[PDB]
Amino acid sequence: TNEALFDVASHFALEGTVDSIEPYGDGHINTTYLVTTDGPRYILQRMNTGIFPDTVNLMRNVELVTSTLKAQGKETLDIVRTTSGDTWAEIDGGAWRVYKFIEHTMSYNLVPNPDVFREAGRAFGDFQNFLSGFDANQLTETIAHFHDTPHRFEDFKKALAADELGRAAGCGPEIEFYLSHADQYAVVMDGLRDGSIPLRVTHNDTKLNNILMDATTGKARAIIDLDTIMPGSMLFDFGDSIRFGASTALEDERDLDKVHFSTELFRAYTEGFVGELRDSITAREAELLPFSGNLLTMECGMRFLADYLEGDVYFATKYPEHNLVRSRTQIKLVREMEQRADETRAIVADVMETT
């Protein structure tokens, strides 16, 4: 594997002699490596072509978004071209790209304090304003039905019916949760379809670890993981951030007694996010901010459970029950979100008042 990785790196216009190439992060989707040279560092990624089969359109999107950010003077992912001059390469059956390593940054897999999450809100709120500069038609959907929760639920039911590994028998309570909540999945798609929720270009994977913060100041430096930028609703970006970051625990926390929905963290993110968007957010969008957290958490939880039932073909895992463990944290969070619905509505109202 090491020899193969060094060979891959040799296809790119790196500006130093490679000393090591090692797995970096715990991403579920692409395979990411840190390339350390005698000078600069790089991120080398093998794109998951099972999930992103249309590499040409994916890289066209990434090139467009990054070049636009650069034209505005913003720090972003800097593609390092192949020695042949291309934005990526097919090498020995894999699709590979390289970015410059963004130095002097911190990222977080869990909110350590409310200020970090407030800053995350500012960063993703600001990113909505950036993406509003694009026509929906400029950025291709890299994955269809991506936050179409009813479509995700159809996929879940298919996984359940197939029950390829006989795993359904051991996750009855979790299956029942997603079945019983089925009435709740259509709200955003219904509003997009009838024009009552604006169709906007969105990031679509707004977990906290997709923001790099400055290692000294804590100020957002750059939003990363640009692979799912495509038309959607602002509510997908807000709700997914709340899913991941308003939790008191890791997404794959095995001890459910550590998992809670924090209204303090909800408030911190809301203050940052709405602060960037207050005069643009529609009445209907504002009405749905609290529930968007429930919706995206249920969608992701359902996807984890579907993957568990399918033998973990979608998300990377470290052990057999990993996706079940992930699905369970999402369920616990939704149950707590339901209990705090009046509070979160009040928080949104207060932020709307003070901004």
- Chain center to CA of 327: 16
Q: Apex CA 256: angle with CA 251 and CA 260, to 5°?
A: 70
Q: Counting contacts by CB under 6 A, is residue 99 touching ligand ANP?
A: yes
Any known ligand binding at 251? yes
For ligand NDG, which residue of 300, 305, 334, 348 counts as binding (CB under 6 A)?
300
Question: Which residues from 221-280 bind ligand ANP, rule CB under 6 A?
Answer: 224-225
In the bound complex, what is the minimum distance in angstroms from residue 193's beta carbon to ligand NDG?
22
* Residue in 21, 59, 62, 77 binding ligand ANP, rule: CB under 6 A: 77
28 binds ligand ANP, rule: CB under 6 A: yes
Task: Return d(Cα 120, Cα 122) in angstroms, integer.
Answer: 5
Q: Which is nearer to ligand NDG, 11 or 28 (CB)?
A: 28
- Quick check: 303 binds ligand ANP (CB under 6 A)? no
**Is 228 an interacting residue with respect to ligand NDG (CB under 6 A)?**
yes
Distance CA 123, CA 216 (A): 17
Half-sphere exposure of residue 92: CA atoms within 13 angstroms, side-chain side:
11
Q: How far is the CB of 318 from ligand ANP (least distance, A)?
A: 13
24 marked as part of a ligand binding site: no
CA distance 57 to 31: 19
The answer to whether 322 is a known ligand-binding residue is: no
24 part of the interface to ligand ANP, by CB under 6 A? yes
Residues 6+ apart with CB under 8 A from 131: 200, 201, 202, 203, 229
CA distance 49 to 55: 7
Q: Which does 77 bind (CB under 5 to 8 A by kind): ligand NDG, ligand ANP, none?
A: ligand ANP
By a kind-dependent CB cut-off of 5 to 8 A, residue 62 interacts, out of ligand ANP, ligand NDG, none, with none
Q: Which residue has the tokens 């028998």?
A: 169
201: CB partners within 8 A, 6+ apart: 131, 132, 134, 135, 136, 138, 139, 229, 230, 231, 232
The rounded distance, in Å, linking the Cα atoms of 200 and 135 is 8
| Beta carbon of residue 30, minimum distance to ligand ANP (angstroms, whole number) | 4
Residues that bind ligand ANP (CB under 6 A): 24-25, 27-30, 32, 43, 77, 99, 101-102, 107, 209-210, 224-225
* Binding site feature residues for N-acetyl-alpha-D-glucosamine: 28, 205, 207, 251, 300, 303, 314
